[PDB]
Design a protein around this ligand. Structure first.
Ligand SMILES: COc1ccc2cncc(NC(=O)Cc3cccc(Cl)c3)c2c1
Ligand SMILES: COc1ccc2cncc(NC(=O)Cc3cccc(Cl)c3)c2c1
Lengths: 304, 304
């Protein structure tokens, strides 16, 4: 038993973390095979950060201008390209520690592990979620740019996120590994609307199943509800609307506990309308939405 | 900005995770140099788990009975010894991936990262704290025995915890790497008193400093307090008594924010006497005590 905000082991990812220096700026790069991926804002200076002409800024750059360092050994840059908002630097050596990897674009509400890095050195790892508004609530400081988010299935690392920017609101915005930002965000030091963020309902329901599995049952009740009635309650409390696909994904947890998904919806409806009344669920005084149904299954079954 | 329950990168630790099989039982081992450390309850069977005679059970065992597996390759056991509640199996090969390591016994209130493993395979990593009552609130399933807790300074892994047991209350008990349990716990399937657990006050104060550093200031007030007055409040709310040593350790965070430790104590006194009033601090509706002053400094400064 026990329920923690568990991240994937970062080992396979530490072996890809490099330091990228361009001009006066240093950020993190992801060395996979003979390519180093990093945020394109490495070619920028403070003056041009308000609205940079990335194509023009990259033109004044040659392979020898980009300095890629892997721990201590210098990598030789033989090619440079800009793919959306990332630079792909072809290096003459393939990373001996490259794991089996995929570049995947996650959906909002999905979770992943983040390995925060500074100067190519990892400092920590935390599990987080792609918010419905495409922001992430991470922990990032200056120099954390280039830190990646990922998921791990058996031996394959699916890279899903690269950190680029911190919004004035303190939340974080970044891209997939092909350079496409999640959300409407652009790599300019300009004020940007993060958007209205909602609560990932299916994740809160999955965490309620995780609570029952781990002994917390006080929130269970003699009531049930329909998808329609629950969705009216969810709309009032800024929760993502529940669909039959969400109910289907909660099938495994519903079968393990023997609690129908609409009976768990009725418990969540009561928790929303009445609050926690000073109590806790899994050590928390608020409803948690950063555990997908898959995360709860993995943690309560012990998939390695 | 941002404040997460960040764990150390698990890379250096994954390279030491082995699988130990003895008889019908399988648990995790820590392969450092030519020794594999694991919980001694690997030599037990269900019948003798109520009160095992470990000395007698180990006598019926020879080096060839212990099966140590590192990923896929089998290790050759040339020596076996029992040190308190851990077995030290001398293997003929030194772990090529052994990091610079220390075996340290942490104090209650200290934090560490845990790499949960099953069959020698890591599954996740989470940051947690040694509770004042010497239990840990981890996430462990059957087969998680042998999973270690650690801290990392530069390149040195300080191993501080080895998981042995889950108490009937769902909390976890384990040992240091010399086989000494933290707390009064023994490796027997017997009901054991976990003890009264208190809230690590200096950690809650450190997290309040982390809240101010990251924009959350609603809890700050026009009041101050003495060590004595604050300690009366802490006693009523089952918080660890604050000492001048705790105040001294909060010196760096007090200097960064410019908020005197006794003014932050007065804010905590109000939060305890009045609750959060439905609000949150760093995304939480309760007072957090699993971030030491060092953790807050590391996370808000970016030590790699
Ligand atoms: C300067 O202080 C910080 C603190 C925390 C930080 C956390 N994440 C990122 C940082 N910097 C940037 O976002 C730099 C930047 C600016 C505009 C557009 C783009 Cl793509 C990048 C951070 C800086
Ligand atoms: C059998 O199910 C579980 C579930 C979660 C579990 C989480 N941690 C540990 C487990 N097992 C034990 O503690 C085995 C045991 C028993 C008595 C004394 C000692 Cl030293 C060891 C777990 C078992």
């Amino acid at each position: 038993s026990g329920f923690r905000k568990m991240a994937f082991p970062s080992g396979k990812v530490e072996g890809c973390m490099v330091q990228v220096t361009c001009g006066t700026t240093t950020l993190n790069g992801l060395w996979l095979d003979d390519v180093v991926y990093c945020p394109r804002h490495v070619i920028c200076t403070s003056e041009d950060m308000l609205n940079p002409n990335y194509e023009d800024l990259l033109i004044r750059k040659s392979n020898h201008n980009f300095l890629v360092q892997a721990g201590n050994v210098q990598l030789r840059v033989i090619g440079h390209s800009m793919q959306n908002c990332v630079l792909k630097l072809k290096v003459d050596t393939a990373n001996p520690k490259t794991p089996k990897y995929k570049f995947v674009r996650i959906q909002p509400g999905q979770t992943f592990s983040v390995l925060a890095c500074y100067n190519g050195s990892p400092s920590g790892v935390y599990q987080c979620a792609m918010r419905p508004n495409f922001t992430i609530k991470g922990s990032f400081l200056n120099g954390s740019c280039g830190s990646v988010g990922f998921n791990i299935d058996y031996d394959c690392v699916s890279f899903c996120y690269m950190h680029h920017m911190e919004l004035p609101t303190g939340v974080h915005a970044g891209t997939d590994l092909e350079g496409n930002f999640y959300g409407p965000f652009v790599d300019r030091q300009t004020a940007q609307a993060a958007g209205t963020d909602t609560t990932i309902t299916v994740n809160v329901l999955a965490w309620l199943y995780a609570a029952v599995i781990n002994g917390d049952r006080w929130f269970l009740n003699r009531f049930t509800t329909t998808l329609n009635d629950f969705n009216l309650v969810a709309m009032k409390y800024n929760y993502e609307p529940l669909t039959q696909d969400h109910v289907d994904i909660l099938g495994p947890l519903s079968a393990q506990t023997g609690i129908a998904v609409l009976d768990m919806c009725a418990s969540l409806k009561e928790l929303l309308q009445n609050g926690m009344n000073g109590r806790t669920i899994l050590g928390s005084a608020l409803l948690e939405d950063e555990f997908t149904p898959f995360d709860v299954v993995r943690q309560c079954s012990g998939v390695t």
